Amino acid sequence: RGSHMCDAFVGTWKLVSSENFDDYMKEVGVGFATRKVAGMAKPNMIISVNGDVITIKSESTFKNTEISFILGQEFDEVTADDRKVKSTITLDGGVLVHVQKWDGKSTTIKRKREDDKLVVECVMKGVTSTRVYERA
Template identity: 55%
Template sequence: MDRFMGTWKLTSSDNFDEYMKAVGIGFASRQIANMAKPSLLFSVDDQGVFSMKSMTTFKTVEIKFKLDEEFDEITADDRQAKTVMSLVDGKLVQTQSWEGKSTTLEREVQDGKLMVKCVMDDVVSVRTYEREE
């Protein structure tokens, strides 16, 4: 998990609007999300609880988790999901399940960048973050 720690700033986003449509996010919320350039802050406390905080000028959302333990998540678009974060082959894999649906967000550090692959059914979005100094 060490490679994820620190602050990352969104630098590019491909097909994110289509991904949000597939998840079921409404037009107005998608417009705001498409304009937002979030920073992600990863940290860990003394008890081994990880934190991932997404910060924009519109909203800040933080989740706290232990690897491989399900928790209740209220997403940035206010979905109430059951979420599990796992480390798989060096990737931080987040699986959200709600109302009979599920989506997967895979985070991986490649060439010093944080790549986030968002998958909902057959729709894939890739978002790229660069480390903030």
């Protein structure tokens, strides 16, 4: 197999900035103690691609997570904050668009390459948080 456009996400990334994540988590419904501890985390994210399967791992002092998925194909995800959600991730104009659905609610997480950074934009009900990762 040769290159894929998604290979631009592949690598080891470290969180360097976070804006409005507490308010985003509030909107998602995250409880106090989880918000405080999760908010402190400075995770590393490892993204790899193997055939049609994309894997996103996150390692931090808060929680270690891993999701593997095929674009456009819904999967079960247990989030860092312990929600059990139905997730679908697609590629739209170079941007990984990740929708999580649970308990009649929905949130969208966009991951995109900007310069040498990987920018993560999380949106829930008018509230947006921006998290920026750099190469590790």
